[PDB]
């Protein structure tokens, strides 16, 4: 499904992303916006046999298993299909594990380029959450 900006922010707050390991809620809402326009079904094929899945475009090369990606590590120990659900539970759990590595949110290029070091709070501003 395609989340509304505030709707996703509230769901993300509920799923404990606000201040998770120091990342305020804005960072996540912003990353989602630039990664998939808040679309849980977003999909993207890469030059290699990997595909990015979900609202946070998580890669099947390192994070999830789709059963047809060469060199799959499945770090999140989850089927990639679980990252396309309207229920963001899986995408958030995996995102939390990704950001728990040394390079935090720098795992999401879109975040660095279009969110890192900006007034990220502006993304949840206006939302009654």
């Amino acid at each position: 499904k395609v989340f509304g900006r505030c709707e996703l922010a509230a769901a993300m707050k509920r799923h404990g992303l606000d201040n998770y390991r120091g990342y305020s809620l804005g960072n996540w809402v912003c990353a989602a916006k630039f990664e998939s326009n808040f679309n849980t079904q977003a999909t993207n094929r890469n030059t290699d046999g990997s595909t990015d899945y979900g609202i946070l475009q998580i890669n099947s090369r390192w994070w999830c298993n789709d059963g047809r990606t060469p060199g799959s590590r499945n770090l999140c120990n989850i089927p990639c299909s679980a990252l396309l659900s309207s229920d963001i539970t899986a995408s958030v759990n995996c995102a939390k594990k990704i950001v728990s590595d040394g390079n935090g949110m720098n795992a999401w290029v879109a975040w660095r380029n279009r969110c890192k070091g900006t007034d990220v709070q502006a993304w949840i501003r206006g939302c009654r959450l």
């Epitope: 707050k13 509920r14 799923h15 404990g16 992303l17 606000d18 201040n19 998770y20 390991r21 120091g22 390192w62 590590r73 499945n74 770090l75 120990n77 759990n93 939390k96 594990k97 728990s100 590595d101 040394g102 390079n103």
Partner: antibody
């Protein structure tokens, strides 16, 4: 199924170094984050630290400096080194996946001269 | 460091009774609270992750609730194999920390 097993000296002398090995079977040590957790005699638990995919480590500050966590991809194991121990480092040590879904049986290390 | 306080320190029940174990955090941790069971002579076992998410393979009598700083682990109809220690652990901020634990013991 993934399985973990700790091993190493059960006795370390004060001021010396404590070393433990965690053998990973079932999956690659490069395909998950790995941690070390210790349970003191009183039964309290302390999350010592973990090593993630990039090789980056996070160490507990109330310990930090003395601890080092490393891994060996060819042997599919990861390790724990804790320098300058004192009797207070006596505890049951466990290796576990970052997710907490898998734990070793644990191994007791006693610090005594 | 985030401090987690569990209560009661100990609880004596009769198999068949239901129980609720509390864990409170010194700072809000949203839903980043996990529950472990640890029997004597055994390693910890993850029962609930992220405050309320069920773990496939864990008995349905175990459930968790709460958010922010107030959490609860419920066991509806405690069974004879459920006695032991129960700890909560937060993963919201480093260093990860554990509560002091609650001991579930048999009533007689």
């Amino acid at each position: 199924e993934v399985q973990l097993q700790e091993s190493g000296p059960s006795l370390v002398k004060p001021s010396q170094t404590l070393s433990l090995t965690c053998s990973v079977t079932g999956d690659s040590v490069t395909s998950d984050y790995w941690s070390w957790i210790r349970k003191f005699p009183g039964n309290k638990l302390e999350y010592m630290g973990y090593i993630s995919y990039s090789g980056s480590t996070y160490y507990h500050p109330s310990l930090k400096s003395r601890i080092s966590i490393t891994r060996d991809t060819s042997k599919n194991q990861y390790y724990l080194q804790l320098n300058s121990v004192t009797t207070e480092d006596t505890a049951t040590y466990y290796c576990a996946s970052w997710g907490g879904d898998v734990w070793g049986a644990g191994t007791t290390v006693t610090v005594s001269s | 460091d985030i401090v987690l306080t569990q209560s009661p320190a100990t609880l004596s029940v009769t198999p068949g009774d239901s129980v609720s174990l509390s864990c409170r955090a010194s700072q809000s941790i949203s839903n980043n609270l996990h529950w472990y069971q640890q029997k004597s002579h055994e390693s910890p076992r993850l029962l609930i992750k992220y405050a309320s998410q069920s773990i496939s393979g864990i008995p349905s009598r175990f459930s968790g609730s709460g958010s922010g700083t107030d959490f609860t682990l419920s066991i509806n109809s405690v069974e004879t194999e459920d006695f032991g220690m129960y700890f909560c652990q937060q993963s919201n901020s480093w260093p990860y920390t554990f509560g002091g634990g609650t001991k579930l013991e048999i009533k007689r």
